[PDB]
Symmetry: C3
Subunit: 114 residues, 3 copies
């Protein structure tokens, strides 16, 4: 599984262990193998949310299954909570796009998961 967060928050404001904390919390939330969670944080971005350059975040979570109405609601509370706690981003300035991927459309280790 793969989680990307793009933010205008400066790199110095990303705390130590942020990638590690994301890895564990997403592995637990998705039930996917922790050793297989990919996380990508992109700070210092030129972005605006509602025309304002106050701290904001645009995110995506791609997973083969474990995507749905209730599960995405739980992911959003979890992820917004982390961005608020660690990056001081208000949850109403966070978008997270969820993608339920077909196994044939995720490549890894010279093949796909299909």
């Amino acid at each position: 599984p793969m989680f990307i967060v793009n933010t205008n928050v400066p790199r110095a404001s990303v705390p130590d262990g942020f990638l590690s904390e994301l890895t564990q919390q997403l592995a637990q939330a998705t039930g996917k193998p922790p050793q297989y969670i990919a996380v990508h944080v992109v700070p210092d971005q030129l972005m605006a949310f509602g025309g304002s350059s106050e701290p904001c975040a645009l995110c995506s979570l791609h997973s083969i299954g474990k995507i749905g109405g209730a599960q995405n609601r739980s992911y959003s509370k979890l992820l917004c909570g982390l961005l608020a706690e660690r990056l001081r981003i208000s949850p109403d300035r966070v978008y997270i796009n969820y993608y339920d991927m077909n196994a044939a459309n995720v490549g890894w280790n010279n093949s796909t998961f299909a």
Copy 2:
């Protein structure tokens, strides 16, 4: 909605107020309140379009609805026009991927829009 533009154009060539112009033009085009519009500009990128490193842009527009055949044609004229006018990117070196998102797959403010 969320609009991202990645370009090899240098940051200095992105004019001041470009994020706001994108926000206002997208709010009017999509009919969405500008408060709902997130914009992200990534300049100075290592990119090629058709093997050439002339100014180019790879973009994406995600929106819950307001995506379709005629609308995307209109968005593409609008967005290529802005990138041509403000970033001096030729429209034939611009790609824009459009995504009609399900409300259940867009996270915001600790929940989803579903």
Copy 3:
């Protein structure tokens, strides 16, 4: 088509001609004219794969058609081989997400491919 690779590998470790080799190999693999191939390489990223910050890559290939079970398996072997040979990234630390785009959802040159 559009190919993006995000990696924590430093920019200095991206060899000359990497964008060109990706364009040529993707044109041949997808059967699309290289002229239609856009490539985007993002080095020096803050990323982890399984909690580890050893070299890894997160990639995406968007194409109008030429996406499917067998083709994506062939794409993944091809691309992982290139990232292993050129960027020294182990294939088991590479994710590639594949997207079959509808022509109506790809904007280019003030219109779409529909």
